């Protein structure tokens, strides 16, 4: 009932033959025990120890008692009867017992019985499971219990295959059994056929007992000799059949090299082309199964396809990730949109396509995943972020992304990681490419699809472009933003940056320009310009920067600018400025002639003084001079009545003048790290300054009057 | 334990006959073993080696010992008794064992045992399924798992049919078993009938043993001969019955060609004519079941019919989407009409036709659906939407569609999936085509049937067409509204718009025209014209637009329009003008002669100040200058009394004049992004202004007077 699957036709035939042999043995034994008498009549004329057959006919007088006849019969039966006639039932019993022992050797040997039982259990589990049925049907909806059962079955199959493939004990044990059976059959046939002629009805007895009966030789009849001969002939025929069956088994084991299973037909007909071929000690068991039924091997093959594992994992992650877990995983990014982050997942769960409130989706390391058509359900989806993930798409999904998606973020490290269908997404407007794409004589060739992005407005190219692609220059005629981050790689434009007339913004970070090209001056639509991390040394080209009519901002932080050019104040259009973390030695008053200035940082500079005209910028609300050599705070600086926040910390400023409290728009002050003695009393009269905005050292905050402390704490808490 | 179903009645009769034959074999064998002695008396006078048969009578003295009598009996039993008389029970036992082995060959042969057990297991699983009961009762809502297991049963039945139909091992094996039984019966009856005549009570024995007893011939008696003879006659009769049953089985198996099955009663009493004929290796087992009883075959044939599978799969789907949940999913579209969408469904539920009040029906990604006649019930249906859903149709459904529809939405990714019967419709007013269709050597051939619509009024095209089709020009003689979306690809017209004399509204979306074609001006009856995102810079052709007197609304936004020509003031008929997202920097003074303007859009442009002539446009209500360079709000703007919308966000607005309260009709305004330090007191006197209509910073909202804040809160609350 359990191992019957492992018994082919030859095994069951041999079992039935052994049963018949046991019946023959017991019948012969009980027949011999019940009666096996001899009937002996003495020879009156004895020659060569056998009588020569030398009014009406009359009987022969022997003058022998019945007891003497019984004694003669017993003596002749014990002595002159061939051992084959006396021991045939016991010999056939022994032979069939040894045959049964050989047959059950592997079943009763633990070192192989455990493997056989485990294989039977694994095959039954793979056959009766419902997952294999749908796996064959597919050539998706699944239950959690079914998913966990299938996962357990897959791991059990893998561990069992790993354990069994290196054994190679069942095959050689079966070979030994077959060889033993064949040689035993041969020897039994030879000896039994040669000795079956030694049992006969007429047997001549010469036991040499004349002191008790007086006769030398006796002619004895064996009444059951014919029946025993018939039984022996029938047993010989059964042994011939058994040996022919064993020889068929031996031929079957030495014809196709059962150490190897090709497994090609099952994998090719089931579309599971990547099914590895079975090695030794596991191909033999599958050969036995095929002899029994190929259907079990067919149902078991789907657990070794290297694809059904991926499908089962995808279904399991679909089932396990509930909607509530994803809702708890929802995040609001800096742009105030519902973000759902997926990281370290083999595939995209299908449950994420149930929350239509998703706005920005980030995918990171999602290998070999295909975009499901269910993406059309997420109407509110706006941003798709791919991190080192080469994913496939479907026609309905492609159409939905072409007609709904607006922003795409791409982080990659190889050409194959860039989906080819991103070009057809014509509603895409915000693009973020992160990853090297420069190639030797192949650069910017597969990137000709940028023309298709008609609605592209926001572009970010991070590929260490030592050469600027001409396709980007041609497509910039409708772009509005372009931030190129080369990670310090030098930027070469070969006079191709003046063609993007509609480029409203231009950012050059880590481009290592070392000097401002003249093509920036042709960007009359420019409003915010930055050369951060370009190690710029001179910015005197602000003279030619005057062409930019609507240039409302200018950032030059994190550079080697040694001084502020006198021409920078002539661009009255400038409103926001970033000049901190530079090597500026002194600040000329020329810059302070752009009275609409509102953003200006001078932190982490070698400045040791503050000019007089700093207070003439009444629109300024951000003063960041953190970690400077400024040691005296000028009273004229306090004229900026609209200075919401100022940063003075880490400086060498000795004290804060009393004019700080004259500002009612103050909200935040950064003062930690200064050579300050005590905060002024006037600082506590600011209606909008609180402890959140008043960040200073512990002792400096302790220098304030207690009423100022309690007012600040009450304002901050309530 | 009900494996007997595969055994017909004749198999049971043969098994019982074999049991009786085995019983009589055992009886005869134990009788012969226990007592089979022969009693022999020598003939004093012998003629022809036979008994001569020739103061009162006295017994004849033979002078023979009892042991000599026993020897004579044994030698006569060995030699002169016929082998059939001695070995009748053993031959009967051997033949009975051979018959049982033949009967149980296929039952125990693993190669066909697997097929038999799989067939009986599938039959028993099918029999207990409530699916069969429901199908029979069809001549009604159950558990979902019942439908799941029904589909699993259907799939496994199909797989088993595909597997077993290729083998053909059970029919040939059964035929060979029957042939072996018949030939064995013939041989056994021949030899037994021929040799039964030798079972005689008296047997003439001439063993020729003179040196032992001294008599030539003997006259033996077989006391068991009569019982053996009657047992032999009984066994002959049983063998005759067995052979007759075997001949009947052979005739039944060699007359109807069991390699094929009819399956004709199902398509008559149930009209399930989709069941194919069953070929070998499956028809044989079905015939055996029919021999048992045809009920199992009848209740199992339904699983081979795909029509029953489809109908009860649809029934399961209807059970999945109940009416209450269907109406829960029922919503209202953007046109305030009842709409229902079906996404990622295997088929269209029948329950969707319960609600006849639907007007818009969305069918997206519903594979291989045929439009049923049940759509005729939904007389109120007006719009049917197809999103990548290839749909087949029937005559009544198409008849209902041709006279009870308003608009049709067709979204496709491939040419072959669009329905072709759409052209037969005549009640259709709006047709929505979505998907690129242009190809070479078959250009614009799929939509050649668009001319069949003689009532087509509004045409909406999403096909990315390089050139305007001639069929569009042919069908435009009666159109009213045209919406073209080239997805940013440049469109070539070549004077192909003047043929649409009755066209009312012309819409060109993402056509990348870069220049307005002159055929637009020739449509004197045009009402609304759009050039949405067509890379237009100059619109000076308005001199030609002056031919269009009834151009109430002109849409020229999402383009690169640099400056508005002064000739736009000639078109005083403009009422709704969109000019946002353009390079427009200033409003011409002549534009204000168009006093009919009511909707003006200028957001996200280079506007810096508003002309003083804006106050003369009293008809204006909606104004949008969001994200511009507006330094301050002009005073003359406040005299436009019925301005219901003023979008001034993301500007550089500094001071808000107190005259905002003069706009009693002002409802919607925003102050985000504008550096407004303070607010006037008249802002809270406008009845139509509410807190939800006031988009302002929370602290700047607190800057409102507390009475004004309470008034705005009261307005917002109710």
- Please indicate whether, in this complex, the C-beta atoms of B388 and A395 are within 8 angstroms of each other: yes
Structure tokens at B284: 């044989």
Within A344-463, where are the H helices?
395-404
* CB-based contact A221 B74, cutoff 8 Å: yes
- Closest by CA to A652, choosing from A607, A688, A706, is A607
Please check whether residue A325 is in contact with residue A346, taking contact to mean a CB–CB distance below 8 angstroms.
no
Distance, CA of A4 to CA of A123 (rounded, Å):
12
Residue-by-residue DSSP string for B305-332:
-HHHHHHHHHHHHHHHS-HHHHHHH-EE
Q: Which of A676, A646, A677 is nearest to A660 (CA)?
A: A646
Under 8 Å between Cβ of A368 and A335: no
Say yes or no for a CB contact (<8 Å) between A51 and B211. Answer: yes
CA distance B685 to B590: 34
Dihedrals phi, psi of B15, to nearest 5 degrees:
-65, -40
Q: Which residue has the tokens 């049937």?
A: B449
| CA–CA distances in Å: residue B42 to residues A60, A154, B53, B205, B213 | 13, 86, 12, 9, 10
Which of A699, A692, A687 has its CA nearest to residue A713? A692
Nearest to A373 among B63, B67, B344 (CB): B344
Residue A429 sits at the vertex; the CA angle it makes with A424 and A433, to the nearest 5 degrees, is: 80
B274/B388 Cα distance (integer angstroms): 29
Q: Distance (Å, rounded) from C-alpha A215 to C-alpha A211?
A: 9
Determine the Cα–Cα distance for residues B228 and B38; give it in Å rounded to an integer.
14
Q: How many alpha carbons lie under 13 Å from residue B688 in its C-beta half-sphere?
A: 16
Using alpha carbons only, what angle is made at residue A529 by residues A527 and A533, rounded to the nearest 5 degrees?
Answer: 165
What resolution does the deposited structure have, in angstroms?
A: 3.8
Query: B49 CA to chain A: closest CA distance, Å?
Result: 13
Strands B407-411, B430-434: pairing kind: parallel
The tokens describing A238, both together, are 């059964």
Q: What whole-number distance in Å separates Cα of residue B533 and Cα of residue B531? A: 6
Q: Show Cβ contacts of residue A389 under 8 Å, excluding neighbours closer than 6 positions.
A: A363, A364, A365, A366, A367, A369, A417
CB-side neighbour CA atoms (13 Å) of B172: 5
Identify the three-state secondary structure at position A358.
coil
b/e per residue, B7-29, with b = 16+ CB within 10 A? bbeebeebbebbebbbebbeebb
Which residue is listed with tokens 């035929």? B175
- Closest CB to A64: pick one of B44, B65, B214: B65
Q: Is residue B342 within 8 Å of residue B363, measured between CB atoms?
A: yes
The whole-angstrom distance between residue A477's C-alpha and the CA centroid of its chain comes to 45
Torsion sign over Cα A495, A496, A497, A501 = positive
Closest CA to A377 of B352, B188, B362: B362
What lies within 8 Å, CB to CB, of B190 at 6+ separation is none
Tokens read off for A700: 């400096």
Pairing of strands B218-221, B39-42: antiparallel
Residue whose structure tokens are 């070192």: A111
The candidate with the shortest Cα–Cα distance to B581, out of A455, A523, A401, is: A455
- Using only C-alpha atoms, chain A has a radius of gyration, in whole angstroms, of 51
Selecting from B67, B152, B388 the residue whose C-beta is nearest the C-beta of A41 gives: B67
Q: Choose among A9, A62, A426: nearest Cβ to B111.
A: A9
Which chain A residues have a beta carbon less than 8 Å from that of B33? 31, 34
Q: Tell me the C-alpha distance between A504 and A527, whole Å.
A: 7
A144 close to A319: Cβ distance less than 8 angstroms: yes
| Long-range contacts of residues B324-333, Cβ cutoff 8 Å, at least 24 apart | B326/B351, B326/B352, B326/B354, B326/B355, B327/B355, B330/B355, B330/B358, B333/B360
Q: Which residue in B has a C-alpha nearest to residue A6's C-alpha?
A: B110
CB A507 within 8 A of CB A480: no
Tokens matching residue B258: 């069991």
What are the tokens at B678? 């303070």
> What residues of chain A lie within 8 A of the CB of B86, using their CB?
226
| Helix, strand and coil percent figures for chain A, each rounded to 5 | 45, 10, 45
**Residue B46, strand partner residues:** B51
Query: Which strands sit side by side in the sheet containing A202-205, from one edge to the other?
Result: A39-42, A218-221, A202-205
Nearest to A223 among B68, B77, B115 (CB): B77
- Distance, in Å, from the CA atom of B127 to the CA atom of B130, rounded to the nearest integer, reads 8
User: Which position has the token pair 């009156």?
Assistant: A44
Cα B270 to the center of its chain, rounded Å: 23
Element (H, E) at B670: strand B668-670
Give the residue from A29, A54, A71 showing the smallest Cα distance to A220: A71
Q: What angle do CA B660, B663, B668 make, to 5 degrees?
A: 85
Tokens in use for A160? 């069992």
Distance from the Cα of B620 to chain A's closest Cα (Å) equals 30
CA dist B525 and B501 (Å) reads: 7
- Give the contacts of A229 (CB within 8 A, at least 6 positions apart): A196, A199, A200
Give the separation between CA A705 and CA A711, rounded to whole angstroms: 10
Which of B71, B346, B366, B652 is the best mutation test for A, with the most CBs of A within 10 A? B71
Here the tokens at position B640 are: 């436009």
CA distance A493 to A470: 9
Do the Cβ atoms of B461 and B485 come closer than 8 Å? yes
Backbone angles phi, psi at A169, to 5 degrees: -110, -35
Return all residues near A580 (Cβ < 8 A) that are at least 6 apart: A557, A601, A602, A603, A604, A605, A624, A626
Find out whether B538 and B514 touch, Cβ atoms under 8 Å.
no
Strands B407-411 and B458-462 turn out to be unpaired
Tell me the C-alpha distance between A336 and A454, whole Å.
27
Experimental method: cryo-EM
Q: Residue A1 class from Cβ within 10 Å (0-12 exposed, 13-18 middle, 19+ buried)?
A: exposed
Both tokens of A103, joined, read 């047959």
Dihedral angle computed from the Cα positions of residues A318, A320, A325 and A331, in that order, rounded to the nearest 10 degrees: -40
Q: Is A257 helix (H, G, I), strand (E, B) or coil?
A: coil
Q: Report CA dihedral (B519, B524, B528, B534) to the nearest 10 degrees.
A: 10
**Taking a C-beta distance cutoff of 8 angstroms, is the pair B261, B287 a contact?**
yes
B71/A292 Cβ within 8 A: no
Q: Which two tokens stand for residue B302?
A: 């339904």
Cβ-Cβ contacts under 8 Å for B698 (sequence gap 6 or more): none
- Give the number of other CB atoms < 10 A from CB of residue B36: 18
Report the distance separating Cα B225 and Cα A230, nearest Å: 22
| A620, A596 Cβ separation under 8 angstroms | no
Contacts of residue B46 in chain A, CB cutoff 8 Å? 57
Residue A250 C-alpha, separation from nearest chain B C-alpha, in angstroms: 19
Question: Cα(A541)–Cα(A527) distance, rounded to whole angstroms?
Answer: 16
CA B181 to chain centre: 49
The distance of B217 to chain A (nearest Cα, Å) reads 10
Task: For residue A106, give Cα distances in angstroms to A15, A18, A177, A245, A260.
Answer: 15, 17, 9, 18, 21
- Residues for chain B: how many in total? 718
Radius of gyration of chain B (CA): 52
A443: nearest Cα among A479, A487, A492, A480: A492
Burial of A436 from C-beta contacts in 10 A (0-12 / 13-18 / 19+) = middle
Q: Are A403 and A382 in contact (CB under 8 A)?
A: no
Give the three-class secondary structure for B114: helix
Q: What is the 3-state secondary structure (H, E, C) of B127-153?
A: HHCHHHHHHHHHCCCCCHHHHHHHHHH
E-strand ranges in B56-201 read: none
What gap in Å lies between CA B84 and CA B198, rounded to an integer?
8
Question: Which residues, 6 or more positions from B613, have their beta carbon under 8 angstroms from its beta carbon?
Answer: B589, B592, B636
Q: Coil, helix or strand for A139?
A: coil
Say whether A69 and B74 touch across the interface (CB within 8 A): no
Which residue in B has a C-alpha nearest to residue A50's C-alpha?
B211
CA B235 from centroid of its chain's CA atoms: 62
The SS3 of residue B538 is: coil
Question: Whose CA is closest to A314, among A172, A150, A454, A169?
Answer: A150
Largest CA distance in chain A: 178
Partner residues linked to B432 by β-bridges: B409, B460
Q: Summarize chain B as % helix, strand, coil (round to 5).
A: 45, 15, 45
For residue A217, report the phi and psi dihedrals to the nearest 5 degrees: -120, 150
Nearest to B109 among A9, A69, A134 (CB): A9
- The answer to whether the Cβ–Cβ distance between A59 and B159 falls below 8 Å is no
Dihedral of CA A659/A663/A664/A666: which sign? Answer: negative
Picking from B427, B379, B388, B389, the residue whose alpha carbon sits closest to that of residue B406 is B427
State the Cα torsion B115-B120-B122-B124 to the nearest 10°: -170
Residue A317 vs residues A99, A511, B145: alpha-carbon distances, Å: 54, 43, 22
| Cβ pair B19, B97 in contact under 8 A | no
DSSP B228-269: HHHHHHHHHHHHHHHHHHHHHHHHHHSSS-TTS----SHHHH
Residue pair A170/A289 in contact (Cβ under 8 Å)? The answer is no
3 state SS of B415: helix
8 A C-beta contact, residue B510 and residue B490: no
Which helix or strand (DSSP H or E) is residue B508 part of? strand B505-509
Measured CA to CA, the distance from residue A287 to residue A284 in angstroms comes to 5
3-class DSSP string for A174-208: HHHHHHHHHHHHHHHHHHHHHHHHHCCCEEEECCC
Cα gap B428→A374, rounded to integer Å: 30
What is the rounded CA–CA span in Å between residue B230 and residue B235?
9
Phi, psi of B67 (to 5 degrees): -70, -35
The three-state DSSP-derived secondary structure of A321-359 is CCHHHHHHCEEECCCCCEEEEEECCCCCCHHHHHCCCCC
CB A405 within 8 A of CB A425: yes
User: Mind spelling out the 3-state secondary structure of A78-136?
Assistant: HHCCCHHHHHHHHHHHHHHHHHHHHHHHHHHCHHHHHHHHHHHHHHHHHHHCCHHHHHH
Determine whether A427 is exposed, middle or buried from the number of CB atoms within 10 Å of its CB (0-12, 13-18, 19+).
middle
| Residue B645: C-alpha distances to residues A671, B580, B661 (Å) | 46, 15, 14
Concatenated DSSP letters of B574-640:
--EEE--SS------GGGGG-TT--EEE--SS---S--GGGGG-TT--EEE--SS---S--SGGGG-
Torsion of CA A47, A53, A55, A58, to 10 degrees: 90
Cβ-based neighbours of B251, under 8 Å, separated by 6 or more: none
Query: Do A268 and A180 contact (CB within 8 A), yes or no?
Result: no
Q: What is the spatial distance between Cα A161 and Cα A282, in angstroms, rounded to a whole number?
A: 7
Span between the terminal Cα atoms of chain A, in Å: 81
């Amino acid at each position: 009932p359990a191992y019957r699957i492992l018994k082919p036709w030859w095994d069951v035939f041999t079992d039935y033959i052994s049963i018949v042999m046991l019946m023959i043995a017991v019948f012969g034994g009980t027949l011999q025990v019940t009666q096996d008498k001899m009937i002996c009549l003495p020879c009156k004329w004895v020659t060569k120890d056998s009588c020569n057959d030398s009014t009406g006919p009359t009987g022969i007088k022997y003058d022998l008692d019945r007891h003497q006849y019984n004694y003669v019969d017993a003596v002749c039966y014990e002595n002159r009867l061939h051992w084959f006639a006396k021991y045939f039932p016991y010999l056939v019993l022994l032979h069939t017992l040894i045959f049964l022992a050989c047959s059950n050797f592997w079943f009763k040997f633990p070192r192989t019985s455990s493997k056989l039982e485990h294989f039977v259990s694994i095959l039954l589990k793979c056959f009766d499971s419902p997952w294999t049925t749908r796996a064959l049907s597919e050539t998706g909806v699944l239950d959690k219990k079914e998913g966990e059962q299938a996962k357990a079955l897959f791991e059990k199959v893998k561990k069992f295959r790993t354990h069994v493939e290196e054994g190679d004990i069942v095959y050689r044990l079966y070979m030994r059994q077959t060889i033993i059976k064949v040689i035993k059959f041969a020897l039994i046939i030879c000896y039994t056929v040669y000795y079956v002629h030694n049992i006969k009805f007429d047997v001549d007895c010469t036991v040499d007992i004349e002191s008790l009966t007086g006769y030398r030789t006796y002619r004895c009849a064996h009444p059951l000799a014919t029946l025993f001969k018939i039984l022996a002939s029938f047993y010989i025929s059964l042994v011939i059949f058994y040996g022919l069956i064993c020889m068929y088994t031996l031929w079957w084991m030495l014809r196709r090299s059962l150490k190897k299973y090709s497994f090609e037909s099952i994998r090719e007909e089931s579309s599971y082309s990547d099914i590895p071929d079975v090695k030794n000690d596991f191909a033999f068991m599958l050969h036995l199964i095929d002899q029994y039924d190929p259907l079990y091997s067919k149902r078991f093959a789907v657990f070794l396809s290297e694809v059904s594992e991926n499908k089962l994992r995808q279904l399991n992650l679909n089932n396990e990730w509930t909607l509530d877990k994803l809702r708890q995983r929802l995040t609001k990014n800096a742009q105030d949109k519902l973000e759902l982050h997926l990281f370290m997942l083999s595939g995209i769960p299908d449950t994420v396509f149930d929350l239509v409130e998703l706005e920005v989706l980030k995918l990171e390391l999602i290998p070999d995943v295909t975009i499901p058509p269910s993406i059309a359900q997420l109407t509110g989806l706006k941003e798709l972020w791919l991190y080192h993930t080469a994913a496939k798409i479907e026609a309905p999904a492609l159409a939905f992304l072409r007609e709904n998606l607006r922003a795409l973020h791409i982080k990659f490290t190889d050409i194959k990681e860039i989906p080819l269908w991103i070009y057809s997404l014509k509603t895409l407007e915000e693009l973020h490419l992160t990853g090297n794409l420069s190639a030797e004589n192949n650069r910017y060739i597969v990137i000709d699809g940028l023309r298709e992005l008609k609605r592209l407005k926001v572009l970010r190219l991070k590929s260490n472009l030592s050469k600027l692609p001409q396709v980007v220059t041609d497509v910039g005629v409708h772009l509005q933003k372009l931030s190129i981050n080369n990670e310090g790689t030098k930027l070469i434009v070969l006079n191709s940056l003046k063609k993007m007339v509609n480029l409203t913004e231009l950012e050059l970070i880590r481009c290592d320009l070392e000097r401002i090209p003249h093509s920036i001056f042709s960007l009359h639509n420019l409003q915010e310009i930055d050369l951060k991390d370009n190690n710029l040394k001179t910015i005197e080209e602000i003279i030619s920067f005057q062409h930019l009519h609507r240039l409302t901002c200018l950032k030059l932080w994190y550079n080697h600018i040694a001084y502020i050019p006198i021409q920078i104040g002539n661009l009255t259009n400038l409103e926001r400025l970033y000049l901190n973390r530079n090597k500026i030695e002194k600040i000329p008053t020329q810059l302070f002639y752009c009275r609409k200035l509102r953003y200006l940082d001078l932190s982490h500079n070698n400045l040791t003084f503050l000019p007089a005209d700093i207070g003439l910028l009444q629109n300024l609300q951000n003063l960041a001079v953190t970690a400077n050599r400024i040691e005296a705070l000028p009273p004229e600086l306090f004229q900026c009545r609209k200075l919401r926040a100022l940063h003075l910390g880490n400086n060498v400023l000795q004290s804060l003048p009393s004019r700080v409290g004259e500002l009612t728009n103050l909200t935040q002050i950064e003062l930690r790290g200064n050579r300050l003695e005590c905060l002024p009393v006037e600082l506590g009269e600011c209606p909008l300054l609180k402890r959140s905005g008043l960040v200073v050292e512990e002792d400096l905050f302790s220098t304030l009057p207690p009423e100022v402390k309690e007012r600040l704490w009450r304002a901050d808490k309530e």
